[PDB]
């Protein structure tokens, strides 16, 4: 996890080869590509409660809000298993209104 100790990018793995009086390291790394821009927010307010992502960031495609993982764009809908709650929505700078979906009660019809 040391930055730039094993090449440029996120180190995946490395292979050694012998040279005359030396060694050659072939570093395999992961390099992110083809980014898009989005709107973002730190928390989400629902029922007077602030919701934070468990892992990921809240992003908006223009009209809807999703959670994604931070390094590869893979959007999902914001549920109570995606997030955790802390406090009320009066203290966070930049909080946004949206609905956080519960699975249990629409299972219970």
């Amino acid at each position: 996890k040391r930055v730039d100790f094993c090449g440029k990018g996120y180190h995946l793995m490395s292979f050694p080869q012998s040279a005359p009086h030396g060694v050659v390291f072939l570093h395999v790394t992961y390099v992110p590509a083809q980014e898009k821009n989005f709107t973002t927010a730190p928390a989400i307010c629902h029922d007077g409660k602030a919701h934070f992502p468990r892992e990921g960031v809240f992003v908006s495609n223009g009209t809807h809000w999703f959670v994604t993982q931070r390094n590869f764009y893979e959007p999902q809908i914001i549920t109570t298993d995606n997030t955790f709650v802390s406090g009320n929505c009066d203290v966070v700078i930049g909080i946004v209104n949206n609905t956080v979906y519960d699975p249990l009660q629409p299972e219970l019809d």
Partner: protein, 49 residues
């Protein structure tokens, strides 16, 4: 690690709080105090210099 991708600075500070074991609500609920403390700490360096 590649191309520069923008992110707002308080959200970068929250990632970094996660990286030491503190949840990020602890940053967002203290943002103003944390920024005051950083500013006083930076203002103390030029005084010693």
């Amino acid at each position: 690690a590649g191309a520069a991708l923008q992110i707002p600075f308080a959200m970068q500070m929250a990632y970094r709080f996660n990286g030491i074991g503190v949840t990020q609500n602890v940053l967002y609920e203290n943002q103003k105090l944390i920024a005051n403390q950083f500013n006083s700490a930076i203002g103390k360096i030029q005084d010693s210099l």
